[PDB]
Amino acid sequence: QLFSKTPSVTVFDNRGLSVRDIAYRRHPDTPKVTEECITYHQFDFRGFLAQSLDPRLNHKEVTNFSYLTDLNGNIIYTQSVDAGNTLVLNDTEGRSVIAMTNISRENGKDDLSLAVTRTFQYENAPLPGRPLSVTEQVNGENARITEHFVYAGNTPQEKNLNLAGQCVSYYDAAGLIQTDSVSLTGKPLSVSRKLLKNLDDTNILADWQGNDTSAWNSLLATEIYTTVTRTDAAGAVLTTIDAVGNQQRVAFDIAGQLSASWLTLKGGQEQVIIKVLTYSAAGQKLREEGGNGVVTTYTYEAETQRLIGIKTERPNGHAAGAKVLQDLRYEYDPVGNVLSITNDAVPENAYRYDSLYQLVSASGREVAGAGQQGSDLPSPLVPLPSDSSVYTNYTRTYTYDSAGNLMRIRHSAPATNNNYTLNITVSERSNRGVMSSLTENPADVDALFTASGSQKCLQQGQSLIWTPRGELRTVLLVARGETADDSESYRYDGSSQRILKISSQQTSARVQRALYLPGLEWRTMTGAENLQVICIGEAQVRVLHWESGKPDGIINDQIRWSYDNLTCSSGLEVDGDGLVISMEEYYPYGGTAVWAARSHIETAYKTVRYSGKERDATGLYYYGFRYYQPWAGRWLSADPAGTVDGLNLYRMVRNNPLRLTDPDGM
Ligand SMILES: [K+]
Ligand SMILES: [K+]
Numbered sequence: 001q002l003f004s005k006t007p008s009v010t011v012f013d014n015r016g017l018s019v020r021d022i023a024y025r026r027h028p029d030t031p032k033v034t035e036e037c038i039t040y041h042q043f044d045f046r047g048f049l050a051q052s053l054d055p056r057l058n059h060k061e062v063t064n065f066s067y068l069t070d071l072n073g074n075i076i077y078t079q080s081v082d083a084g085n086t087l088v089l090n091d092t093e094g095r096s097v098i099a100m101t102n103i104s105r106e107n108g109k110d111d112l113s114l115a116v117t118r119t120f121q122y123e124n125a126p127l128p129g130r131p132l133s134v135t136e137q138v139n140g141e142n143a144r145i146t147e148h149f150v151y152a153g154n155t156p157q158e159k160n161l162n163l164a165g166q167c168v169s170y171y172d173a174a175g176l177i178q179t180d181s182v183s184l185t186g187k188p189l190s191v192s193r194k195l196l197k198n199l200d201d202t203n204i205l206a207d208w209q210g211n212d213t214s215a216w217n218s219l220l221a222t223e224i225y226t227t228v229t230r231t232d233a234a235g236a237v238l239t240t241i242d243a244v245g246n247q248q249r250v251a252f253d254i255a256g257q258l259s260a261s262w263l264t265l266k267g268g269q270e271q272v273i274i275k276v277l278t279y280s281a282a283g284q285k286l287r288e289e290g291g292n293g294v295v296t297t298y299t300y301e302a303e304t305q306r307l308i309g310i311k312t313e314r315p316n317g318h319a320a321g322a323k324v325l326q327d328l329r330y331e332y333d334p335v336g337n338v339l340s341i342t343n344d345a346v347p348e349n350a351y352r353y354d355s356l357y358q359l360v361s362a363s364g365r366e367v368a369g370a371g372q373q374g375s376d377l378p379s380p381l382v383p384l385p386s387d388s389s390v391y392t393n394y395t396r397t398y399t400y401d402s403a404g405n406l407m408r409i410r411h412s413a414p415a416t417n418n419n420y421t422l423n424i425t426v427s428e429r430s431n432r433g434v435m436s437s438l439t440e441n442p443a444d445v446d447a448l449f450t451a452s453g454s455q456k457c458l459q460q461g462q463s464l465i466w467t468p469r470g471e472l473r474t475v476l477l478v479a480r481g482e483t484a485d486d487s488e489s490y491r492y493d494g495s496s497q498r499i500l501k502i503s504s505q506q507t508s509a510r511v512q513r514a515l516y517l518p519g520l521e522w523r524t525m526t527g528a529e530n531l532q533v534i535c536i537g538e539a540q541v542r543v544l545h546w547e548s549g550k551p552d553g554i555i556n557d558q559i560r561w562s563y564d565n566l567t568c569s570s571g572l573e574v575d576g577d578g579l580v581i582s583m584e585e586y587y588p589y590g591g592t593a594v595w596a597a598r599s600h601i602e603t604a605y606k607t608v609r610y611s612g613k614e615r616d617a618t619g620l621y622y623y624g625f626r627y628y629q630p631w632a633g634r635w636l637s638a639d640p641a642g643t644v645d646g647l648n649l650y651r652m653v654r655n656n657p658l659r660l661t662d663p664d665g666m
Contacts, residue, residue: 001031002031002354002600003026003354003355003587005024005105006023006024006026006034006036006355007024008022008023009022010022013043013045015047017041017043017047018041019040019041019042019043020038020039020040020041021037021038021039022036022037022039022483023037023039023356024036024037024040024355024356025037025354025355025356025402026355027354027360028352028353028360029360030134031109031436032181033401034355035404037055037356038055038058039052039053039055039647040053040058040216041053041460043071044069045414045522046069046071046073048067048069048073049065049067049074049463050066050067050068050316051065051066051067051197052064052065052643052647054402054403054647054648055402055403055430056401056402056403056405057081057403057429058169058428058455059402059465060428060429060570062079062081062429062430063079063204063543064080064081064082064647065078065079065080065081065647066078066079067079068367069225069295069589070334070652073167074090075088076089076369078495080453080574080638080649081267081429081430081639082430082431082432082453082648082649082650083355083452083453083626083638084101084103084104084293084451084452084453085103085104085451085637086099086100086101087099087101088100088104088468091578092120092458093129095120095122095129096120096626097120098117098118098119098120099117099119100116100117100118100467101115101116101118101452101470102116102211102452102470102526103115103450103451104451111412111451112196113139113140113567113582114138114139114450114451115139115433115451116136116137116138116140116468116469117136117138117139118134118135118136118137118196118468119134119135119137120133120134120135121133121134121365124216129149130149130167130293130588131149131167131452131654132149132319133145133147133148133149133208133402134146134147134148134589136468136469137238138468142378144205144207145171145207145208145209146172146173146206146207146208146494147171147172147173148169148170148171148208148216149167149169149170149207149235150167150168150169150170150171150213151165151166151168152164152165152166152168153330158265158658161181161182162181162182162183162184162186163179163181163182166179167219168180169177169213170494171206171216172206172493172494172495173196173205173206173491173492173493173494174193174195174196174199174206174218174491174492174493174494174499174500175193175194175195175196175206175221176193176194176216176217176220176552177191177192177193177493178191178192178194178642179191179477180192182314183229183231183235183340184273185231185233185537186235186488187229187231187235187237188229189207189227189228189229189230189231189594190227190228190229191223191226191227191229191341191518192225192226193221193223193224193227193323193499194217194220194221194223194225194245195220195221195224195225195500195516196219196220196221197219197220197221198221198396199491199500200502200513202299202473202474202489202608203242205324205621208351209385218468225243225517226243226583227240227242227243227262227518228240228241232252232275233255234504236252236256237250237597238251240251240311240518240519242517242518242520242521242534243480243517243518243520243531244520244522245266245524246263246264246265246266246532246545247263247264247268247521247536248261248262248263248264248519248536249261249262249263249264251502253279255279257279258274258277259276259277259473260272260275260276261273261274261537262276263534263536263559264545265534265543265545265557268557270520271291272290272291273290273291273541273559274288274289274291274541275288275289275290275291276288276289277289279333279529280300281282281300282305283299284298284300284305284307284562285298286298286666289418289485289492290561291559292561292574292575292576292578293314293318293319293320293446293578294312294313294314294325294561294574294578295312295313295314295315295443296310296311296312296313296315296417296563297309297310297311297606298310298311299311305337306330306332306336307330308329308330308331308332309327309328309329309330310323310326310327310328310563310564310565311326311327311328312324312325312326312327312563312572312574313325313326313327314578316580318555319531319577319578320578320579324344324345325345325458325563325572325574325580326332326343326563326572327343327344327345328341328342328343328565329342329343330566332539333353335357336565337351337357337656337659338351338566338658338659339351341565345346345387346350347365347388348363349362349363349364350362350363351363351588351658354400356655357654357656357659358398358400358404358654358655359394359398359588359655359656359657359658360397360398360399360400360655361397361398362395362396362398362588362658363393363394363395363396364393364394364395364396364585364588364593365391365392365394365585365593365594366392366413366418366585366593366594367381367390367391367392367476367593367594367595367596368391368392368394368413368415368416368418369392369413369416369417370418370593371418371629372411372420373411373420373422374460374574374592374619374631375618375619375620375629375631376619377592377594377595377615378440378593378595379595380582380596380597380600380603381594381595381597382596382597382598382599382600382603382618383596383597383598383599384580384583384596384597384598385559385596391594392413392415392416392418393413393415393653394411394412394413394593395410395412395413396409396410396411396412396587396588397409397410397444398410398633398655399425403429403431403647403648404646404648404651404655405426405433405434405634405648405650405651406424406433406633406634406652406655407424407426408421408422408423408424409421409422409424409589409633411424412472413618415637416527422435422436422632422633423435423440423632423633424436424633425438425439425440425441425442425445425447425523426442427442427443427445427446428442428443429446430445430446430447431454431635431647431648431649431651432446432448432449432650432652433445433632433634433650434455434632435455435459435631435632436449437459437460438459438460439458450466451520452466452470452562452637452638453637453638453649454466454470454472454636454637454638455636455637455652458475458618458620458629458636459632460475461478461479462475462476463476463479463633464476464616464636467492467529467636469492470494470640471580472490472492472620472636472637473487473489473490474487474488474490475488475489475616475618477505477618477621478505478506480506481487483507483642484506484522485504485506485508486504486505487503487504488501488502488503488504488616488617489502490502490617491503496625497516497624498516498622499515499516499517500515500516501514501516501616502514503617505527508527509527510525511524511525511526512524512525512617513525513526513528519534519535519536520533520534520535521533521535521607524660525549527536528548528549529544529546529548529549530547530548530549531545531546531549532544532545532546532547533545537626538562539608540562541559541560541561542559542560542562543557543558543559543560544557544558544605545557545558545559551601552601553599553601553602554601554602554643556621558575558576559575559576560573560574560575560581560605560606561573561574561575562612564612566658566659566660567611567657567658567659568611568612568659569586569610569612570584570606570608570609570610570611570612571583571584571585572584573597573602573606580597580598581597581602582595582597582598582600582602582603582606583597584596584606584609586609586610587630588632588657589630589633589652590610590611590621590628590633590657591628591630591631592609592610609663610623610630611623612627615630619631620636622665623663623665624663624665624666625640625641625664625665625666626639626640626664626665626666627665628652628662629666633652633657634650634651634652635649635650635665637653638666639652639666640666641666
């Protein structure tokens with residue numbers, strides 16, 4: 001009813017070019033008011049895209065994007081109000097050769113004072129011109145060679161391992177990845193990671209100079225982290241032995257779908273993780289029984305293949321008794337927005353959207369009185385509630401501008417009087433926006449970001465340092481001048497995937513290290529706990545194996561099943577006996593509304609929460625390419641993928657976080 005006369009329109013010029021995107025925004029509270037939102041696209045004399053303007057900024061004579069191309073329409077130079085200015089160029093072979101980023105302006109001209117220049121080097125003739133190295137140089141500083149590739153030859157030794165023509169040695173920002181063996185099916189059977197020595201010091205940086213691997217191997221720490229894989233005839237992975245010797249095993253059905261999975265801890269016997277897994281005709285998971293006897297049943301809508309039911313239960317005849325642990329029921333609008341959710345065990349979440357399918361209202365429950373939402377998790381409710389009066393109902397309202405910037409989250413919890421409003425202050429010349437506690441003046445928002453559009457201050461006392469590639473380097477949590485600061489640093493591989501996280505807090509010093517490897521998280525705590533987290537699935541089931549510092553209250557090699565919702569948010573942790581360990585509910589944009597557990601000690605070992613992503617101690621969710629602020633409803637930096645999902649480079653899953661999920665950030 002709210003959607004009458006709200007189509008999507010594309011307006012063309014006389015040469016088949018889309019010069020206008022027209023939407024029609026209508027709020028359910030004011031159904032007589034329809035805002036015509038117009039996005040403008042201007043094309044040049046050569047028929048290529050030159051300018052793009054959102055409905056908001058166009059009114060203020062500011063251009064979201066400007067492009068300058070070659071004679072074929074390939075973009076060379078870009079001006080972004082969100083991502084700053086950039087310059088790229090590819091060669092005649094189509095390969096990237098240069099990318100200059102983090103450029104601003106002011107005085108009129110472009111400010112190159114902090115420009116980052118990444119260049120790509122390839123094998124020269126008579127070689128096939130394979131990738132040779134990647135060089136990275138910040139303005140005024142020396143160039144570092146951040147990547148180097150080494151390829152195997154034609155020797156019988158190399159052929160027997162199927163390595164001929166393969167990049168056998170990859171030197172990245174973290175150190176070295178060696179490919180030891182390749183399957184007959186072209187799949188890696190053995191890879192080994194070596195870390196650069198002293199990655200604990202944030203000032204030590206990779207720099208692979210020259211063409212001698214002997215001189216480089218000396219810069220690597222001694223430990224070798226080898227992941228071994230065994231694949232089937234169709235190239236699918238069957239077994240995996242991680243760097244510490246644990247094995248994951250899978251088996252597929254007659255249709256080649258994952259049908260069972262097992263785990264064999266080092267020195268242990270094989271045990272069932274997933275016993276049986278059935279699928280719908282559309283290949284969606286239907287019934288999934290785990291080793292804890294717990295059964296998840298997925299119910300789908302016949303006409304649409306939409307997931308309308310998620311039922312996790314201890315079935316009849318279970319050793320711990322029959323019980324429905326979770327029974328999520330989804331009701332959708334004809335377009336597929338989640339209108340409502342129910343859980344059987346009365347509780348109900350209701351949702352209202354605008355004609356653009358932006359979430360404008362959300363009802364739910366929280367443990368009241370929690371207090372005003374921030375970067376922190378609520379204190380866990382221990383033990384598990386027996387009564388539901390412990391929860392109170394809340395209603396949140398969401399307010400967006402013409403460019404999709406979430407400006408306001410109005411939290412209303414009347415009964416416990418837990419009422420507050422989270423305001424986001426948006427720039428008047430960009431999509432850059434921060435919480436009002438940082439500034440309430442639109443004119444001061446842009447200074448709080450880099451030229452690339454990466455946020456420099458998380459909260460009031462907390463600053464953000466970034467890598468030249470735009471990766472998050474350091475979160476300064478408690479600054480103490482000189483020179484003992486509560487902080488958390490990060491390291492990434494050549495693919496910009498996180499490999500290392502180091503948290504430091506003053507007490508000599510509490511240091512928490514997290515090493516991310518295939519199917520494995522190696523977490524140490526000093527100031528000593530040595531924890532190895534086996535990640536099973538792709539991550540669904542997690543196993544906690546202590547080599548040292550196992551706390552009382554938790555048995556070693558503890559298996560934790562995770563049970564999610566529609567958008568993959570970890571809601572229930574359940575042990576090997578099928579007993580609920582923790583339960584967690586989320587505000588639509590990620591904040592934790594409910595956090596409960598059967599013990600205080602088991603709470604500290606859940607890291608993955610919203611959208612199946614890890615929440616770091618900083619409060620940020622790490623998605624892969626970008627960090628997410630669940631309290632501000634937006635990304636911490638501009639989309640590195642650019643305009644693939646609209647002009648707004650900060651907008652979070654198109655402002656519909658109940659239907660949509662983001663896999664990486666990018
Ligand atoms: K519509
Ligand atoms: K061979």
